[PDB]
Enzyme design. Structure first.
Site, PDB file in Angstrom:
ATOM      1  N   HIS B  97       0.814  -1.189   0.000  1.00  0.00           N
ATOM      2  CA  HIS B  97       0.000   0.000   0.000  1.00  0.00           C
ATOM      3  C   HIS B  97       0.855   1.249   0.000  1.00  0.00           C
ATOM      4  CE1 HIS B  97       1.065  -0.575   4.243  1.00  0.00           C
ATOM      5  NE2 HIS B  97       0.912   0.726   4.364  1.00  0.00           N
ATOM      6  N   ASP B  99       0.543   5.056   1.820  1.00  0.00           N
ATOM      7  CA  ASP B  99      -0.224   5.498   2.975  1.00  0.00           C
ATOM      8  C   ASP B  99      -1.207   6.605   2.672  1.00  0.00           C
ATOM      9  OD1 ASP B  99       0.971   3.684   4.989  1.00  0.00           O
ATOM     10  OD2 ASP B  99       2.614   5.058   5.134  1.00  0.00           O
ATOM     11  N   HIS B 248       4.749   0.200   0.318  1.00  0.00           N
ATOM     12  CA  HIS B 248       5.507  -0.619   1.253  1.00  0.00           C
ATOM     13  C   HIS B 248       4.631  -1.701   1.823  1.00  0.00           C
ATOM     14  CE1 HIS B 248       3.950   2.912   3.533  1.00  0.00           C
ATOM     15  NE2 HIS B 248       3.720   2.029   4.486  1.00  0.00           N
ATOM     16  N   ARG B 263       4.540   6.161  14.093  1.00  0.00           N
ATOM     17  CA  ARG B 263       4.598   6.849  12.813  1.00  0.00           C
ATOM     18  C   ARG B 263       4.192   8.336  12.818  1.00  0.00           C
ATOM     19  NH1 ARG B 263       1.067   4.947   7.900  1.00  0.00           N
ATOM     20  NH2 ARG B 263      -0.071   6.951   8.288  1.00  0.00           N
TER      21      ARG B 263
HETATM   22  O1  LIG Z   1       4.760  -1.732  10.799  1.00  0.00           O
HETATM   23  C1  LIG Z   1       5.527  -1.453   9.890  1.00  0.00           C
HETATM   24  O2  LIG Z   1       6.743  -1.982   9.868  1.00  0.00           O
HETATM   25  C2  LIG Z   1       5.047  -0.493   8.828  1.00  0.00           C
HETATM   26  C3  LIG Z   1       3.517  -0.451   8.940  1.00  0.00           C
HETATM   27  C4  LIG Z   1       2.977   0.472   7.884  1.00  0.00           C
HETATM   28  O3  LIG Z   1       2.614   0.162   6.805  1.00  0.00           O
HETATM   29  C5  LIG Z   1       2.908   1.920   8.230  1.00  0.00           C
HETATM   30  O4  LIG Z   1       3.289   2.335   9.435  1.00  0.00           O
HETATM   31  O5  LIG Z   1       2.518   2.639   7.381  1.00  0.00           O
HETATM   32 FE   LIG Z   2       1.973   1.984   5.650  1.00  0.00          FE
END
Ligand SMILES: O=C(O)CCC(=O)C(=O)O
Ligand SMILES: [Fe+3]
Ligand SMILES: O=C(O)CCC(=O)C(=O)O
Ligand SMILES: O=C(O)CCC(=O)C(=O)O
Ligand SMILES: O=C(O)CCC(=O)C(=O)O
Ligand SMILES: [Fe+3]
Ligand SMILES: [Fe+3]
Ligand SMILES: [Fe+3]
Lengths: 275, 275, 275, 275
Positions: B97, B99, B248, B263
């Site tokens: 995806h 984000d 990612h 994040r």
């Molecule tokens: O948990 C992760 O390593 C990345 C998860 C993810 O796709 C995000 O935080 O956007």
């Molecule tokens: Fe993500």
């Protein structure tokens, strides 16, 4: 002495340091290593500036070697295959395959030595046949357990790319044959998927559209990131893997830089399935 | 001072050390870093034991933040999203995806901080929209350049998994909308694929079977290993990426161990295409 | 008296003339016909200028009727569904489906009366679930025999096309439910595929990618011409079929001409699988 | 005299009666017929107990004939191909193809005579390249217009099924070559899809995965029932079609009964695309 082994994932991969490859391994270390190559399916070692001869020796500790019928060999060591890629010989390994599954008794392991590398790129990844099998639903395990699939040297070594006389040679000497879709590991006894896009042409025990649907499914399934490890190469890196329950893919993203890799290929026994 | 930047591939990824994240970055380092996040599409930094507040601050250096309408936030920092996965909250990010492409103005970047990790697993990979575009044949670039595709928050946040009142909320506040299939980078001006399996439902400018065929093709294409980088996490690792020309995927292979990631999400402008 | 029955293929279809539909069928003819609808899976009769009432009566000879929760009904006969297609109501049946498999007890048969036709087009085809099953390899029969799949009224009657209050009605009254992938015919006892692209969303007994691969395979398989019959309609044509071991598709290639078809829908029992 | 022509659909197919095939056609009828074969893409005539010679003559009225390099011919008429299928020679035409697109100048038409038929089955269907083209979205028309695809006699006449000396013959005499994906009709000037699963191996003007995705899409698209007509054969039936803007498929569902069909094959000019 105890080898340091660092797992790179829950399933496949590990990195080790304990060896002076230059030097023959003490029975004791060889069986820590041997066991590491089985638990993890691939292992990586760094800073191992070995020669072809020294590489062949280490391979032999695992078993008899196999000679590739196409690829060129090292100086005076015909057991170690040379992969020198560049503009005049572009890389053909950017495709998920298991090595030499076009023979009755496809190799149990191989040892890759990173001799000469480009600035970046050239990463090689490995995918677990065990983890992929475990990821199939039961009805799928039951469907695939017992099917047989045809492997064809020709699918990954087509005529047009070849010499044509030495190619025919290797063809008449390597006709398409069948291996089980699900392979039982001769040592661990673990079940693992055993088709590979490089050589598997069709699942012979179903209809054509059926085979086609199962293979498209399978050639994508083994592609799931969880089933894998990816190695960023460094000079004198050594890679060692269990070719009976993995596939691997070598990135084609470094041309026109040159890249040199030596391989020792270890003969395996005859793949089978058991319940 | 000069940041050490080590590329992890010809296309995507790089690792840097020069910062004491704990400390605000000198204008000068911030623009080495900023430029690194653009040249490479993702950058990784290790040993950065920052707090949420300190992470939010660094994000702000890039632009206004976005608040996720679903995911929980940190203590008293609603701009930093908390991803605490485990048995009682299994991970949902094992899927390619980009984000928040379900908003008009999907984020230009995000900063991921590895707070608490399991023994192994949890690797996260990134795929380049630039490299994937460059890999399309011309007729395909011409076909995709100019098409528009619908993105639907709902495709990756389905009703059944939800609260149902706060879910409806985020739905009525985030209806499906269109973005260009091929996005021109607002800074570099480079062309990049801009669909993602997580939110892209259909290419609206073709027929249904047509869209379906193009998306199956595209959702597999971006999966080519050459287009990617894979990061093996370590505690206090920082990841920073350009969310406008990447996708990612975060591996789901660590349960029942726990894993905590913070994040910061940075608002972008409106994606467009130009020739 | 003996009905003239002309088979239209080795598997599915037949055309009959012996009836004066206008008139109730003599027990004797009804069981020649009944048996013809089972041997062949669809039967076609021409020159049968019946009324809705008269059609409902003939349906009843087969069993209780079912009332569609969406489609409009005839004058004062709510058991006979009216399909009046044209620009203001474009046809939605150009898609392989089995009628009303979104209920526990999907219909055993239906009777279609061609009331008003366009110059040409509007052909409707039927595909045999029996012939498709017989065409699967054994391992595929073993894989599919015993799986269950979810059927969702919503997949072929989406919200956006609707009233929205009477649509919700029919939804809460018809939730997704499971039927066997391979259905054993309650009378003949013959095995037949029993998924349909119109309502089948997923095979619940495998993984998601697995289901997806099997359904793509199946939604194409039933499409093989050998498994089918195609009827070129003529006014006052009657079509009668065994909805428990077939699917059908009605061409959308006559707009803006109008086309009127009456349907009687006959309730079946609960589909099952046995070995 | 006026021929009776009954269209079997809005697009493709028509049935005619006006001819006494036994007798040479009056210039006047030949151009009603000729024009019917163009407007509709296939036409069917019944009750035409012609001989091979008489069939060849009628073909010649359309143009020079082509001799098949593999298939057997009639008694002393090498222009008329014999298709005698049964257990000792199972039918190979149950696959969508356009006849002889493996030559520079693939046939403009063919005339099929139903000589000896089984009880039922053996239906042959035709799909319109014009209707399929018109069904593509504009961006798809623009994508496909101008691409070229390789046709390979070998794809539908593989080595293993063959003699091997006379097969090689026909191979060295018919190497893979390119035709346009979208063909402009040399007379009507109408645009039509011009790939066929029987002989088309790859769209050479895109990448391999790209070609693969477009062909899977196309080999399914032409399969849409609206694009077709299906003929239930009867002895002494004649079928005549425009092989430059259609494909056809002949059901394999009559073994072990025997089935005999005679074909006259008419040479066409060189397919092209224009805007
Ligand atoms: O948990 C992760 O390593 C990345 C998860 C993810 O796709 C995000 O935080 O956007
Ligand atoms: Fe993500
Ligand atoms: O070149 C590499 O990195 C690996 C190539 C390969 O597939 C092999 O040596 O088997
Ligand atoms: O309209 C037709 O020809 C058939 C429509 C259909 O699928 C039905 O009545 O069930
Ligand atoms: O046998 C048929 O009905 C048609 C076979 C065929 O494809 C042909 O004659 O070209
Ligand atoms: Fe290899
Ligand atoms: Fe229906
Ligand atoms: Fe043909």
């Amino acid at each position: 002495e105890r080898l340091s082994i660092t797992p790179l994932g829950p399933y496949i991969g590990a990195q080790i340091s304990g060896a002076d490859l230059t030097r023959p391994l003490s029975d004791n270390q060889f069986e820590q290593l041997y066991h590491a190559v089985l638990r993890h399916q691939v292992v990586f070692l760094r800073d191992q500036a070995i020669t072809p001869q020294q590489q062949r020796a280490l391979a032999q500790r695992f078993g008899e070697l196999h000679i590739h019928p196409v690829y060129p060999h090292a100086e005076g060591v015909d057991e170690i295959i040379v992969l020198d890629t560049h503009n005049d010989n572009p890389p053909d390994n950017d495709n998920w395959h298991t090595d030499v599954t076009f023979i009755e008794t496809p190799p149990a392991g191989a040892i890759l030595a990173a001799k000469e590398l480009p600035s970046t790129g050239g990463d090689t990844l490995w995918t677990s046949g065990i983890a992929a099998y475990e990821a199939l639903s039961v009805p799928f395990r039951q469907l695939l357990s017992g099917l047989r699939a045809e492997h064809d040297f020709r699918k990954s070594f087509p005529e047009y790319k070849y010499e044509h006389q030495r190619w025919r040679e290797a063809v008449a000497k390597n006709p398409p044959l069948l291996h089980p879709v699900v392979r039982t590991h001769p040592v661990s006894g673990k079940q693992a998927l055993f088709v590979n896009e490089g050589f598997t042409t069709r699942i012979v025990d179903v209809s054509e559209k059926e085979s086609e649907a199962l293979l498209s499914f399978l050639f994508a399934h083994i592609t799931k990131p969880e089933f894998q490890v990816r190695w960023r190469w460094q000079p004198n890196d050594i890679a060692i893997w269990d070719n009976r329950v993995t596939q691997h893919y070598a990135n084609a993203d470094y041309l026109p830089q040159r890249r040199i890799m030596h391989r020792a290929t270890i003969l395996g026994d005859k793949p089978f399935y058991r319940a």
